[PDB]
Design a protein around this ligand. Sequence first.
Ligand SMILES: Nc1ncnc2c1ncn2[C@@H]1O[C@H](COP(=O)(O)OP(=O)(O)O)[C@@H](O)[C@H]1O
Ligand SMILES: Nc1ncnc2c1ncn2[C@@H]1O[C@H](COP(=O)(O)OP(=O)(O)O)[C@@H](O)[C@H]1O
Ligand SMILES: Nc1ncnc2c1ncn2[C@@H]1O[C@H](COP(=O)(O)OP(=O)(O)O)[C@@H](O)[C@H]1O
Ligand SMILES: Nc1ncnc2c1ncn2[C@@H]1O[C@H](COP(=O)(O)OP(=O)(O)O)[C@@H](O)[C@H]1O
Ligand SMILES: Nc1ncnc2c1ncn2[C@@H]1O[C@H](COP(=O)(O)OP(=O)(O)O)[C@@H](O)[C@H]1O
Lengths: 375, 375, 375, 375, 375
Amino acid sequence: DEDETTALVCDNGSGLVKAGFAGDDAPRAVFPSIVGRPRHQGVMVGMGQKDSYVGDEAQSKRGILTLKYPIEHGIITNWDDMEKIWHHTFYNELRVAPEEHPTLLTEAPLNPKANREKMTQIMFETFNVPAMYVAIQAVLSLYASGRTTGIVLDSGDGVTHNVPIYEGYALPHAIMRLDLAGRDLTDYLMKILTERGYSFVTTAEREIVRDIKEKLCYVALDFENEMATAASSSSLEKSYELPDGQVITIGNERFRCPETLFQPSFIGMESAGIHETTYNSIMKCDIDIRKDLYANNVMSGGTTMYPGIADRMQKEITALAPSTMKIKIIAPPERKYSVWIGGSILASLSTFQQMWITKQEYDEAGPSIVHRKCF
Amino acid sequence: DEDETTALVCDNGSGLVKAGFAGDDAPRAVFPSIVGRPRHQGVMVGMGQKDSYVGDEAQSKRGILTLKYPIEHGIITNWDDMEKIWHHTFYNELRVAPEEHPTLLTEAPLNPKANREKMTQIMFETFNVPAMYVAIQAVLSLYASGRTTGIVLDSGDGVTHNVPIYEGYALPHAIMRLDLAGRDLTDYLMKILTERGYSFVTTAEREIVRDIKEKLCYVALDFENEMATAASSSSLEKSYELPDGQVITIGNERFRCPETLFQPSFIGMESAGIHETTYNSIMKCDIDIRKDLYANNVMSGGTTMYPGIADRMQKEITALAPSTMKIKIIAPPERKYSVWIGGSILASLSTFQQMWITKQEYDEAGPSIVHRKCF
Amino acid sequence: DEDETTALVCDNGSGLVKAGFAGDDAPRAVFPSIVGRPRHQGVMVGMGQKDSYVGDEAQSKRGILTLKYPIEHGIITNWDDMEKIWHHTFYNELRVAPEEHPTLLTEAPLNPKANREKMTQIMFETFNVPAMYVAIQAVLSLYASGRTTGIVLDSGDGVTHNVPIYEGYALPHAIMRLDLAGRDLTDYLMKILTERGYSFVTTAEREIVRDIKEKLCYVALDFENEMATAASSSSLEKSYELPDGQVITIGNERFRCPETLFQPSFIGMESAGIHETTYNSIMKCDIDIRKDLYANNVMSGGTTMYPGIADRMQKEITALAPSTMKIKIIAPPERKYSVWIGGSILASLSTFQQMWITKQEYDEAGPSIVHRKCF
Amino acid sequence: DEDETTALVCDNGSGLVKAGFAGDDAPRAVFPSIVGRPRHQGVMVGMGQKDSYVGDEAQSKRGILTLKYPIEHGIITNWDDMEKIWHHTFYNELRVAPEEHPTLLTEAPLNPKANREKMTQIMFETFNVPAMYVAIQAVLSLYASGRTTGIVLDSGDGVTHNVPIYEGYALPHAIMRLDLAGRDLTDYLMKILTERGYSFVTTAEREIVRDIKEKLCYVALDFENEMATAASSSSLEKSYELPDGQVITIGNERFRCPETLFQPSFIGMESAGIHETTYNSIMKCDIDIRKDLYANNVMSGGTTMYPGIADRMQKEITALAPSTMKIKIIAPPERKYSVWIGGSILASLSTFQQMWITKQEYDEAGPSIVHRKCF
Amino acid sequence: DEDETTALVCDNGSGLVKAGFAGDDAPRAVFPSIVGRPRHQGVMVGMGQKDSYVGDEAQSKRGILTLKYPIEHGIITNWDDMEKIWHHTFYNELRVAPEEHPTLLTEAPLNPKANREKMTQIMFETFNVPAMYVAIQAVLSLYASGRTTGIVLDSGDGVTHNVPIYEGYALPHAIMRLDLAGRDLTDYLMKILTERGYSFVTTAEREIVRDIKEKLCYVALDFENEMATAASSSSLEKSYELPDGQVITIGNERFRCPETLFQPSFIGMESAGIHETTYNSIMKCDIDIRKDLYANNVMSGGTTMYPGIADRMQKEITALAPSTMKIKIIAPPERKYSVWIGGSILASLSTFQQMWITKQEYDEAGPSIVHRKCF
Ligand SMILES: Nc1ncnc2c1ncn2[C@@H]1O[C@H](COP(=O)(O)OP(=O)(O)O)[C@@H](O)[C@H]1O
Ligand SMILES: Nc1ncnc2c1ncn2[C@@H]1O[C@H](COP(=O)(O)OP(=O)(O)O)[C@@H](O)[C@H]1O
Ligand SMILES: Nc1ncnc2c1ncn2[C@@H]1O[C@H](COP(=O)(O)OP(=O)(O)O)[C@@H](O)[C@H]1O
Ligand SMILES: Nc1ncnc2c1ncn2[C@@H]1O[C@H](COP(=O)(O)OP(=O)(O)O)[C@@H](O)[C@H]1O
Ligand SMILES: Nc1ncnc2c1ncn2[C@@H]1O[C@H](COP(=O)(O)OP(=O)(O)O)[C@@H](O)[C@H]1O
């Protein structure tokens, strides 16, 4: 730094802009991926001294704002804020120039192809960065576990992926991405608060909804059996005092939202459970490889941190998995910051310098340079 | 070794690469002739530590690989892999230099003229081997036994040979070759199983078919009498559990594939079984040899070790053979390494040392040294 | 009929249930072979008229039904409906008694051996028909075309066969069958639409996928060469309006799924396309057979009605064919019902009166009569 | 004819049933001596309309058949077809009744004595023929040259003969027959295709092998000297494009198979060269007769039509022949049809009517009438 | 021997090397004159144990050999091997040096002038032999019979002799030699089986033929009457189970082959009968010599031992010989060693030692010392 290239590590995901420096094991800046916009209206004389709201600063105020989500479904809908997000990352959190170091940002797999170019364009040309790489999300989570073969089950905010990866980067398989992760479960809960009685309509309390979900809603081994227990619950029934005033009694609700993740039928969707994809991708592969795919079940992303998520994959997996192989869940103590931890690993590499896309490359090999390095 | 020339004893055949040192008593290194290649696909950051997997290292994996077979019919299909094989044999499976040992390899009788030269060349030019000879397959099973005359029914893995042998070795007027050994039987077993109800499409589980064959498909004493027992299947069936959650009950199939051995008509092949050729080759031989050819029916190679295999040649041969000579089937308890063990004995003789072709001789007489020394 | 024995001709395969009578030029009753099942749910006042939908009746509505396919892989996956399908054939769509006429059905090559009997047993024992035979799929397609010698590339409606045929009918050997089919392709198109930007899921729109395939998706002469022309689409992009209200611009898609037929490598499957097998099967054959196989490339089945596929076989076939024999495609003008037409010819011969199984033989000799006649 | 006896001329040899009429110089029917048998198997509806295959009709199809050889080694193994051969000759080629004319067939010298009777038996008694004679093969070839003393060297398909004949029919000498002619050379070539690399196993391509031999494989003056020339051949090395697809490179092979005829050591036999028999038979005869035996070296039969066969007998003969006599090869422009040309000569004789065996004679002088006229 | 000079007694003839010492009663060492040479070829590490198999050692094995003959027609055809034949006879069976013992050999009457000297030369010059006499062959059977005068019909194996012998030394006026004995009979049996339906031409199995002749083949009483007995078959045909399971029914052949002895006419020889020459030589002699010549028709040599041979000469002789005297066949019990016994006698008298030629006498009067005593 100031004479060494030394990159950053940015996991500009759809849930947290997990930024931090190269070779670190903690992301310095962690702040949401919601950009805020007013709705309070009125006159002014004094003001909040802002009018453009970004990350944690956006989050701060919710009572005066409607919280827009720049990245939905791994597609960045609004690019105008993205320079300013990254200006909030480099200048205003990490306290660095875009010029001093590259920037490793994340690509959510099977991304819309125009975004890959569009992003770089904002960086190099408009925000002068010496280099950058838009890595493949899921792959970074493999390296985080220290695994080098397995089935990476990354359920981050916006997208879930069942990615079988081999020692050397895999050839197209049933490597897949699906929207069914954390945001979606946030949107399901609100459905179910509609038939409850408690009111939660807008963006501003939707984030509060996402909070009520994360820290309580344990993953039932089977919904139906804990459903019957709901009748004379004692440990299923507790009140989650809303931390700004209200009691939010949650009975059946607690293991109703987590079960939805693996059974999209509770929404009224036809999508496959994430444990179905697990079977599909592993069975497809040669008989002698299934043993190691089922041995190494990597489960990263914050969504796979609900209480009792671990014991859920012990029956779900054994269902449509044979008796000819060991079945063992890999779930590292922390796993929310999983794509960011992996990029840090790459940045400790000097080959990643030459596996990243240079400033000069953009002008020298046209815009298609992007897809030339990310394949 | 390390003090004397002391060769290798190598059975570079199409079934097992039976490697070892000369003067050794067993092939220390023994591993099938399979070259592995990827098909993991997906996201790789790890590495299987090869791309062109070979031998035992390939054999480990089956679920990540596709299995090529480099010597088919005792004919080296691709010599480029043979080069990678020997680089794995000498250096990494025997942990010796070839710039030290001579090498005894095997030749399936009556091969292409080129194989003999192609083999010698890779040895002298690409391993600087002090000397080597690629002795003639079937003949060696004769030296193993201590026998000096007989009819060698070497059924290796792609090739069957009816070599009536004498100490002044038989001329090409009695010796015969026909493709009908072990690999050819494997692709029939699955054939008749496709209509059963199990699937053997990919290569890696074709190998599994080869396993099922050896340790459960016994040779029918009379196909027709065991066919009739099929009405009351009980002794017929017996499940071979395959650990991917399946059970493989095999009925008439257990003895159906072995009768194909003796009747190529079920293949669609118009050729004669192994018990017919026996007659042909003795009837070609001189009258004053035929009683002892029948005394000395040597039945070698790993294919001729299925349960009940030997006893079929006690009734079939005797069928259209005379009743005027003592029929004794010579089928030792072990005849897998019949060629390998015989190849040790010759590699412990010093006249076989002067019978084999030195490094320098190859420059003195070209590639053609082979056919100048051996025929 | 009712005054003549007049059999049926039924192509009870993976296509439609093509029924009609012996010596008919068309299958008068034609309705598919998908079976429909309810899923309307809730309070119900009337009824959907039918409980289980069969044939055409099922195909009609899909928005109230979830669509089973009782026959997948040429393996009858559910027998219970087959009974109503033949009841739907004779009684309500041709309005005859099964006891009036015999029945000619199809057997796809290397069917499971129980399926052959199972079918017969419900027909003869549970519906009674004076006689019936389950003829061999491909062989009928030869006589339909009018040839008597060639390479029949009968790609029926779920199952592909490369049958080199002669005046005598080929023995198991270079007659092969493979699952690699239109219905399999259907699941490859929906696959690629994920982040590309379209959505297809359920059963009811899987059938629409099959539609999008047939009438717009033509096979590239070489994918890679029309792929690059994609760069600016003009001859690629066209719109397929889908009823629901939504436009389906298809660029590369037109020839991307169709190439996958000839190239299961893009699926992720190790298997070889059907034109590789065409070479394989011909090199397997004896040389006094090969000149007429390339000379008369008979291209049968509903898969060779795909647009730009015949022209695909002018370069695919000619590629690894000797220039020592003429090569010329025999393409019939229509060949979807090639197996039905050919079976009609057989049901219009009297030699067939003795080539079929009479009702009474089934009770008289145990169910192995099936395999006694169609071996 | 229809009032004149007028015989046929039939050379029912082991290579061609050379039939034609009396006094002709062309055999009308010439067609092989191979009777065909199926091996294609299968079902049938249409068929080839035959199931018994005979001569050229047999030859036609090879891809559906295995070609049996009724006459091997001048011994007719299958008599069942022989009526049908002769029915294919008289009725179906020459277009005559067996009753209208006699039939002159050939006896290969030193024939198994039961065959002479066995043949007549089929004719007179079962196929009513007014007369017949089974002439002595070699003798007919003498008359063809117009010679009346010499040494007849008939190398037809199955048997070679060195027959010294005097003006009047000879008294037993070293008049001999040997199997070493054309068929045998066909069987040697296949040996040598085994060590080449090209595959030719069965009956069906063996006839093709016989073709590759006849029209290319020139007779070396000395093998060994043209062997050295093989190194940088230009006129020795040419490719015999197989006329149904393949190139068949033939180098050393060309003058390797023809040299075998005179040197049985290349097989691995101990038999005498045909030029050794020449010395033996001539030297044995009185000193004053050798001059005319060596003057008239008659070389008939198709086998003695390879290119450079003529110049071969100019050194071979002079080797062990003195300086006291002229040495001159008699080899008529055509000489394949040599036994048939000679019988035509006999049939222009009216003494041959009385030197043939009458219908009536068989019943009137028992079966031994046969050996009474042929001595 | 080691106590007296004691010669050998050798009746060095074509049918056996009848060897022994002087003073013995029978030849100990008896073995046919066959020299073996390899013929199976090939490469080797084992061996046939000789490469110039000779005598008893050659006769044991035959299946790996081609059999040279060194004395034919009682003319020693080759001397090169004869030396080696004696090197196995003297050294290795008689177990003594020829550098240490004299030698009684045989002279077949009327040998060419070199033969008498050539034999003797290898014994004096190369074996150094102390003394030797090569007595005259036929004469010895005379002394063996007890006779002093008579007509010796000495028929060993190569040479038949009609020797009238005087009390002393007869003169040439009726002594004759004709080559027509045993070995000729052998080539006629294999001859007459070829038209019958068998082959046994080659040397290795010719010896077997020779075995069949001697212990089976009996001379008829007259060909013509047992030729008429041929009508019935019961007394003709009888299977000669030849070890190898080859059953050989032979009818007229047992007594068809022996007649050839008395009749060269079936060979095609214009030479007359050996039984004709007997009369001729006695009709040449004076009347005061014939009465006792007919009293003494001495019949010696192993050819004169077929059952039915002797008794035939009571009808043959009396046919064209007078009835005024006693025709008595002196037919000894056994007469295979007939020449060996006569030499044993002579070699048991010391005056024959003194009638024989010492070593030094060879140098002292050159090679012509031979014809000086034994002319
Ligand atoms: N401890 C937790 N238990 C279960 N779900 C959680 C937990 N932590 C985070 N999540 C959920 O996962 C989503 C946040 O994912 P995040 O890692 O920020 O996303 P991205 O990888 O898209 O940047 C949120 O919906 C949140 O509720
Ligand atoms: N019991 C058995 N009968 C038959 N095949 C067997 C048996 N046991 C092992 N085999 C297998 O069959 C094949 C025999 O071929 P092998 O003799 O090793 O061949 P090559 O001479 O071609 O190297 C081997 O692959 C071996 O593992
Ligand atoms: N003219 C056509 N071109 C392409 N496909 C067509 C055509 N006509 C009908 N189809 C539809 O597409 C499929 C044709 O191929 P299909 O018969 O399914 O073959 P396969 O044996 O490979 O499954 C059928 O499902 C059919 O309904
Ligand atoms: N032109 C030729 N040159 C050399 N060999 C030939 C030629 N013509 C025929 N032959 C060979 O001679 C044999 C055919 O002999 P053929 O006259 O038909 O027999 P037969 O007299 O037994 O009826 C075949 O092996 C064939 O290859
Ligand atoms: N006991 C026998 N009966 C009939 N033939 C015999 C008998 N023994 C020998 N012969 C035959 O007579 C010939 C052998 O004569 P032999 O005395 O050995 O000859 P030579 O005096 O030339 O050495 C052989 O052909 C043999 O088959």
